[PDB]
């Protein structure tokens, strides 16, 4: 697990055991944005709802927003994601399977909108703690698209 903005917003891959969730708690994680698709979660845990219930059982508030591996969120999902991440400032954890592609993309987009950074700077900030963040052309194109419509996005988010 890594913090992009200390105790405010960080990223991670898909945990394998509950003990890893306890470590998240020790680091200050309070809320979790789950990005992998059902099958990806089932692949590791055996059942998607069981995994989500386990996050709740251990005192974390989860939101499941399924994004295809190597892909990006739809506009509807992104609005939902940004409102979720902004509704509660501290302890936000975003995770995918590897904690590099979808996670890096969301975290970078977050910085683009909240800190007014260019795509290059946003990815730079994420790669400082998570090397290789943002993997695909579509993910890169999504970020450029978000930067180009920052005003429109901020307008809809706030």
């Amino acid at each position: 697990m890594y913090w992009v903005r200390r105790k405010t917003i960080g990223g991670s891959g898909l945990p394998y055991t509950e003990n890893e969730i306890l470590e998240w708690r020790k680091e200050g994680v309070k809320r979790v944005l789950v990005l992998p698709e059902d099958w990806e979660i089932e692949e590791s845990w055996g059942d998607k709802d069981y995994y989500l219930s386990i996050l709740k059982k251990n005192g974390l508030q989860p939101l499941h927003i399924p994004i295809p591996d190597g892909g990006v969120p739809s506009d509807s999902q992104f609005l939902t994601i940004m409102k979720w991440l902004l509704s509660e400032k501290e302890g936000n954890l975003v995770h995918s399977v590897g904690g590099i592609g979808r996670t890096g993309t969301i975290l970078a987009s977050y910085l683009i909108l909240t800190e007014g950074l260019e795509v290059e700077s946003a990815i730079d900030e994420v790669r400082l703690v998570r090397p290789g963040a943002v993997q695909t052309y579509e993910q890169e194109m999504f970020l450029l698209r978000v930067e180009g419509m920052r005003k429109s996005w901020l307008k809809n988010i706030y």
Partner: peptide, 5 residues
């Protein structure tokens, strides 16, 4: 995707 470095 393609994880495991």
């Amino acid at each position: 995707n393609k994880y495991g470095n």
